[PDB]
């Protein structure tokens, strides 16, 4: 596991983000002929488990409602991650209530590129 992690770190350099931060993630859609898109959303869960690390991204749209994604951190499809902001919360219960009641999470209405 450590051998693979060392190789990955030489290829990518991501920031040390936490739960509650707003992130911009660049990904490749293999289904759509490997086209690049940029997603903006809130980080609601982060798991630090070595090569199996992952996180969840949350966003809300104008009419369609909430949308959640689960993304492996070492997946090659992800190209870049950046921190753009922060959303305050009190505890897990407060964060869960915010997710269920979609509100003030419409950073960008659609995906770029």
Partner RNA sequence: AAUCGUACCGCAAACCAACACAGGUUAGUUAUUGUAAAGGCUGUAUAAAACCAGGAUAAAGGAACUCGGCAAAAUAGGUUAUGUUUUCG
Partner RNA sequence: AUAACAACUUCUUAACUGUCUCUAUUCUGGAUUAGGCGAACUUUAAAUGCUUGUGCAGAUGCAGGCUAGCUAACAAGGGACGAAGAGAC
Partner RNA sequence: GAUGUUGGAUCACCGCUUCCUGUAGCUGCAAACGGUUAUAAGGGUUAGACUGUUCGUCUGAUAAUGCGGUACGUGAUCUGAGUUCAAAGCGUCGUAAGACAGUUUGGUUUCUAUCUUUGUUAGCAUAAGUAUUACGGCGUUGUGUACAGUACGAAAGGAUUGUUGCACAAUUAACCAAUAGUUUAAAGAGCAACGUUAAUAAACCGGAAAACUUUUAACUGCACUGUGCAGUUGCAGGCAAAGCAAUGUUCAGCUAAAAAAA
Choose among RNA, another protein, none what residue 37 binds, the Cβ cut-off being 5 to 8 Å by kind: another protein
CA distance 93 to 36: 35
Residue numbers 5-44 binding another protein by CB under 8 A? 28-32, 35, 37
Cβ within 8 Å of residue 41, ≥6 positions away? 22, 23, 25, 57, 58, 59, 69, 105, 107
Regarding 64 and contact with another protein (CB under 8 A), the answer is yes
Q: Closer to RNA by CB, 3 or 88: give it.
A: 3
Nearer to another protein among residue 80 and residue 86 (C-beta): 80
Q: Which of 1, 88, 91, 93 binds another protein (CB under 8 A)?
A: 1
Specify whether the CB–CB gap between 43 and 56 falls below 8 A.
yes
């Amino acid at each position: 596991e450590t051998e693979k992690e060392v190789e990955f770190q030489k290829q990518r350099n991501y920031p040390d983000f936490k739960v509650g931060d707003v992130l911009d993630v660049t990904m490749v859609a293999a289904e759509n002929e490997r086209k690049t898109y940029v997603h903006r959303g809130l980080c609601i869960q982060k798991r630090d488990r070595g090569y199996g690390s992952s996180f969840k991204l949350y966003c809300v749209f104008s009419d369609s409602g909430g949308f959640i994604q689960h993304l492996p951190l070492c997946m090659p499809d992800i190209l870049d991650i950046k921190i753009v902001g922060q959303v305050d919360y009190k505890d897990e219960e407060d964060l869960k209530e915010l997710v269920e009641s979609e509100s003030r999470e419409c950073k960008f209405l659609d995906k770029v590129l």
